[PDB]
Design an enzyme around this catalytic site. Structure first.
Site, PDB file in Angstrom:
ATOM      1  CD  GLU A   1      42.197  43.722  28.990  1.00 24.92           C
ATOM      2  OE1 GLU A   1      41.608  43.846  30.082  1.00 24.92           O
ATOM      3  OE2 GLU A   1      43.102  42.885  28.812  1.00 24.92           O
TER       4      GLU A   1
ATOM      5  CE  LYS B   1      37.826  41.840  32.736  1.00 20.00           C
ATOM      6  NZ  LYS B   1      39.092  42.214  33.426  1.00 20.00           N
TER       7      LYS B   1
ATOM      8  CB  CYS C   1      41.093  40.217  30.753  1.00 18.58           C
ATOM      9  SG  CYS C   1      42.722  39.969  31.353  1.00 18.58           S
TER      10      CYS C   1
HETATM   11  C1  LIG Z   1      42.907  39.568  32.695  1.00 19.74           C
HETATM   12  S1  LIG Z   1      41.930  40.066  33.875  1.00 19.74           S
HETATM   13  N1  LIG Z   1      43.953  38.660  32.998  1.00 19.74           N
HETATM   14  C2  LIG Z   1      44.432  38.894  34.338  1.00 19.74           C
HETATM   15  C3  LIG Z   1      44.400  37.614  35.154  1.00 19.74           C
HETATM   16  C4  LIG Z   1      44.758  37.963  36.594  1.00 19.74           C
HETATM   17  C5  LIG Z   1      44.995  36.761  37.499  1.00 19.74           C
HETATM   18  C6  LIG Z   1      44.990  37.177  38.971  1.00 19.74           C
HETATM   19  C7  LIG Z   1      43.832  36.543  39.738  1.00 19.74           C
HETATM   20  C8  LIG Z   1      43.656  37.075  41.160  1.00 19.74           C
HETATM   21  C9  LIG Z   1      42.237  36.821  41.669  1.00 19.74           C
HETATM   22  C10 LIG Z   1      42.157  36.798  43.194  1.00 19.74           C
HETATM   23  C11 LIG Z   1      40.727  36.638  43.702  1.00 19.74           C
HETATM   24  C12 LIG Z   1      40.646  35.957  45.066  1.00 19.74           C
HETATM   25  C13 LIG Z   1      39.315  35.232  45.240  1.00 19.74           C
HETATM   26  C14 LIG Z   1      39.151  34.647  46.640  1.00 19.74           C
END
Ligand SMILES: *C(=S)NCCCCCCCCCCCCC
Ligand SMILES: CCCCCCCC/C=C\CCCCCCCC(=O)OC[C@H](O)CO
Ligand SMILES: CCCCCCCC/C=C\CCCCCCCC(=O)OC[C@H](O)CO
Ligand SMILES: CCCCCCCC/C=C\CCCCCCCC(=O)OC[C@H](O)CO
Ligand SMILES: CCCCCCCC/C=C\CCCCCCCC(=O)OC[C@H](O)CO
Ligand SMILES: CCCCCCCC/C=C\CCCCCCCC(=O)OC[C@H](O)CO
Ligand SMILES: CCCCCCCC/C=C\CCCCCCCC(=O)OC[C@H](O)CO
Ligand SMILES: CCCCCCCC/C=C\CCCCCCCC(=O)OC[C@H](O)CO
Ligand SMILES: CCCCCCCC/C=C\CCCCCCCC(=O)OC[C@H](O)CO
Ligand SMILES: CCCCCCCC/C=C\CCCCCCCC(=O)OC[C@H](O)CO
Ligand SMILES: CCCCCCCC/C=C\CCCCCCCC(=O)OC[C@H](O)CO
Length: 520
Positions: A280, A341, A393
């Site tokens: 990435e 993305k 990701c």
């Molecule tokens: C690549 S993007 N890996 C990163 C994963 C991040 C995980 C965090 C998720 C947080 C999302 C919150 C959304 C709330 C929806 C109601």
């Protein structure tokens, strides 16, 4: 007829009754779910967790059922996704009290993904006097529950119970109905085991309960390892490059050039292979301003009869002034294409309510970003005449979304940066969900990471080749292009979703239906 209330003196009534003991059991019950997921992987815990919740809702009124569902969800996310704190503290530079308050707020809010369905179950759906219908209705409620979680706000499809069966006995059902069918059967089982004692007095009903309980399990074992897809061509030799470039959130000129020179110097010596993959934002320069570095890297790949696939920030100059940014990946060498993305992490790549919150985020010195979402329909990446489905990701996390791109492809590819979460269980959970995509799709997945768990995943979701995280390394391996459609990629959720809707509609109507003491 059946009340369902446990006989007095059994020490089990507090579980299903209003009050704090039932909530505390639900809190612990929710906290089991990460245990059943990677890396611990004690998959029978998934059934126990759900069974405990189902039992704790049996007699419960709507208001206390809502809060008991909140406590369950608080335990699931407070224990399962609390690792998000690492990125905010270590790389966001927030203090531990600050980062704790943020994660406290987050998991308390996200815990309403289990509170709302619980309330819905109590007020409108639960039928305590029908053990077999209640189990089906609860399983079908569990699907709606996870489906809703993939969609609402941006979605947070983390900790689906189905992922515990990746190497579990239900792995045969995943190519058939996806992670969704896996969660469905785990919930269906869990409710049947609770109500199974109630069917002991009756032979025929108990027999039917046993077929529903163990039938699907037998079917999953019978289909475990079955290949729904066939080879589409000659194996591809793949090289992935993992350079532990320390994440510097303030991005500085002298470290940029050392990135460009690190990835180049590591690629050249590799004896000829079909695919070179970079993770990435492997090249930190904008796409337009990296023509020189990009152009040279193509000829280097051309001399190696290979395609180079790397992540690069992509810029779009509008008619008026300033640009717009995207987290993209592009192919040079024996291939073409650039993917942008689509799913963006809220508060990581963008600020969901920027007008009010911008000033607030700035006073607490918290990092901010302005990436934009990729278009609805994008072409797949091309490399050596093959259709490669791209995932950046956590796009890998959205199963319906992944299936659309996984179909119309012969190999799966994801680049992701798990650096943010360090030594926590986040990257392992993230990686596990990537393997499920391979198992649903019957395709190979290439996963290159800047530092965390790069590997090659066979169509059964098994990690055939990987290299250690947290150190600079190169992964050499072979992946096979795949043809043919899995049943899940053929029909998707709809067959199961329609079955669930029927079961929910039956329960909703049947709960209020006169039981043959009719007024007419
Ligand atoms: C690549 S993007 N890996 C990163 C994963 C991040 C995980 C965090 C998720 C947080 C999302 C919150 C959304 C709330 C929806 C109601
Ligand atoms: C009493 C009714 C009979 C039913 C059977 C007994 C039910 C209670 C058993 C276990 C719950 C306790 C589990 C404690 C919570 C799990 C631990 C945990 O959350 O650890 C995750 C960790 O944080 C990841 O990093
Ligand atoms: C740890 C919390 C303790 C509370 C439990 C009290 C009641 C247990 C209830 C059901 C059986 C669950 C026990 C299952 C043991 C783990 C399953 C297993 O053996 O999995 C192997 C592992 O996945 C290989 O990687
Ligand atoms: C969606 C993000 C969250 C936004 C807000 C969602 C709803 C908040 C409601 C009250 C907050 C303070 C709660 C105060 C405690 C309520 C206690 C209660 O209602 O208990 C009743 C009892 O359980 C029955 O017997
Ligand atoms: C509302 C507060 C929003 C908190 C923003 C989240 C955050 O600061 O995340 C930092 C990130 O790790 C940087 O890469
Ligand atoms: C059963 C109780 C479940 C609820 C539990 C509390 C939930 C409160 C919310 C946020 C706390 C913020 C602190 C979160 C701390 C997690 C830190 C972490 O997981 O870091 C992993 C570490 O790096 C590995 O080496
Ligand atoms: C965006 C994130 C904002 C979340 C803010 C508040 C949610 C607070 C909800 C906590 C309420 C718990 C109430 C409870 O546990 O009920 C008590 C019980 O009923 C006694 O008998
Ligand atoms: C039902 C239970 C859900 C309750 C909310 C869950 C978590 C809130 C945690 C804070 C995360 C806030 C960021 C999500 C967001 O606001 O996304 C907006 C998006 O743009 C929309 O289109
Ligand atoms: C195949 C899958 C096997 C995996 C089983 C693992 C955990 C199941 C835990 C289930 C806990 C069952 C509790 C039984 C119960 O509580 O029954 C109460 C009933 O209402 C009395 O009349
Ligand atoms: C009170 C309610 C608090 C709401 C905000 C709390 C947590 C969300 C923080 C955002 C999650 C962490 C974002 C940083 C991140 O995950 O970075 C990934 C990277 O952007 C991909 O390549
Ligand atoms: C679609 C509607 C599903 C049919 C509902 C019939 C039903 O729920 O009846 C259950 C029970 O017999 C009520 O006494």
């Amino acid at each position: 007829h059946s009340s369902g209330l446990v006989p007095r003196g059994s020490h089990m009534r507090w579980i299903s009754r209003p009050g704090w003991p039932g909530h505390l059991l639900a809190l612990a019950a929710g906290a089991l779910t990460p245990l059943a997921l990677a890396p611990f992987d004690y998959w029978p815990l998934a059934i126990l967790s759900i069974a405990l919740l189902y039992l704790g809702l049996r007699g419960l009124p709507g208001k206390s059922a809502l809060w008991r569902g909140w406590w369950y969800g608080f335990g699931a996310f407070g224990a399962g996704t609390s690792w998000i704190y690492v990125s905010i503290h270590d790389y966001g530079a927030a203090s531990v009290p600050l980062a704790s308050l943020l994660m406290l707020g987050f998991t308390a809010g996200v815990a309403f993904f289990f509170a709302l369905p619980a309330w819905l179950w109590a007020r409108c759906l639960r039928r305590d006097n029908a053990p077999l219908g209640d189990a089906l209705a609860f399983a079908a409620l569990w699907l709606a529950l996870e489906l809703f979680r993939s969609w609402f706000l941006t979605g947070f499809p983390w900790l689906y119970a189905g992922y515990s069966q990746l190497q579990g006995p239900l792995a045969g059902l995943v190519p058939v109905g996806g992670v969704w069918l896996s969660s469905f059967v785990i919930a269906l089982s869990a409710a049947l085991l609770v109500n199974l004692p109630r069917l002991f007095p009756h032979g025929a009903s108990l027999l039917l309960g046993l077929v529903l309980l163990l039938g699907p399990w037998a079917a999953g074992l019978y289909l475990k390892g079955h290949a729904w897809t066939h080879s589409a061509g000659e194996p591809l030799r793949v090289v992935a490059i993992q350079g532990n470039i320390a994440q510097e959130l303030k991005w500085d000129p002298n470290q940029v050039r050392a990135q460009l020179d690190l990835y180049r110097d590591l690629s050249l010596p590799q004896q000829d292979v079909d695919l070179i993959v970079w993770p990435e934002t492997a090249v930190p320069i904008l796409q337009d301003m990296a023509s020189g570095y990009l152009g040279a890297m193509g000829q280097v790949a051309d001399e190696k009869n290979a395609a180079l696939i790397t992540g690069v920030p992509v810029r779009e100059r509008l008619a008026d002034g300033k640009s717009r940014y995207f987290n993209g990946i592009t192919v040079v060498g024996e291939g073409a294409g650039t993917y942008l993305k689509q799913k963006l992490v809220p508060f990581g790549e963008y600020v969901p309510l920027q007008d009010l919150l911008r000033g607030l985020i700035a006073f607490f010195d918290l990092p901010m970003s302005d990436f934009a979402r990729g278009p609805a329909d994008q072409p797949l990446l091309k490399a050596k005449g093959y259709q490669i489905a791209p995932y950046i990701c956590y796009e890998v996390v959205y199963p319906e979304f992944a299936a659309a791109l996984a179909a119309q492809s012969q190999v799966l590819l994801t680049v992701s940066n798990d650096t943010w979460f360090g030594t926590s269980i986040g990257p392992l959970q993230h990686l596990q969900m990537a393997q499920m995509r391979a198992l649903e799709s019957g395709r190979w997945m290439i996963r290159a990471t800047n530092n965390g768990v790069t590997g090659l995943i066979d169509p059964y979701g098994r990690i055939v080749r990987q290299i250690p995280q947290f150190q600079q390394g190169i992964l050499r391996g072979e992946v096979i292009p795949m043809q043919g459609l899995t049943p899940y990629l053929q029909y998707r959720v709809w067959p199961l979703a329609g079955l669930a809707g029927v079961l929910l509609l039956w329960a909703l109507l049947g709960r209020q239906l006169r039981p043959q003491e009719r007024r007419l």
